[PDB]
């Protein structure tokens, strides 16, 4: 939902 890109 938020920026969950690692």
């Amino acid at each position, epitope marked *: *939902a*938020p*920026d*969950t*890109r*690692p």
Partner: single-chain antibody
Amino acid sequence: QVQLQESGGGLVQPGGSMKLSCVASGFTFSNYWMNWVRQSPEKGLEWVAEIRLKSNNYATHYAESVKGRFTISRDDSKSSVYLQMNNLRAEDTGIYYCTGVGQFAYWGQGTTVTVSDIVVTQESALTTSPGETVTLTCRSSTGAVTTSNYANWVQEKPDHLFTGLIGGTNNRAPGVPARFSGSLIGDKAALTITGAQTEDEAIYFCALWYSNHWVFGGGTKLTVLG
């Protein structure tokens, strides 16, 4: 080493306008959302605004207290993010930080602006010793913290120096020591230091996500004695 460098703060009159900048290096800026977060002595850490990617049509969201007054924007060809602040109030006084990545790994040094509901609760203070296991907790007034709150933990050391430790509940940020861990325990988010070290004396903040905004906790002062 990633760097974020803010600029444009100062000393302004109520009703005034100001634009802050932040330039980034060392990571693919255009692939990550960016945020502005401010720290004030009275209101603590406060999330201000986010801006998403080009592929999201640069969607933006704002804290209710700045809506219609502040505008966040980015220029991916200059690896920069901006905050345009209109109709400034005394309440807007603070240190302003640009921050992002998984979700608050990287923080700039901050730029000072002087103008002249969900509550997230943390332990005010905790005291430990080197080599102890210490657990900090983060509770929400809404009910249980779950993995859909994407709990982050950030550390503040002198002087107003921030580094992200944990995002997405339990993912360590790159280069964060192994002794730091994130968990969910009895419907609270939790940060555990397994074998505390003297250098871990600091203020620890949690942040929780609620659909389209972040709420920061009040911080815990951790003292490491002996």
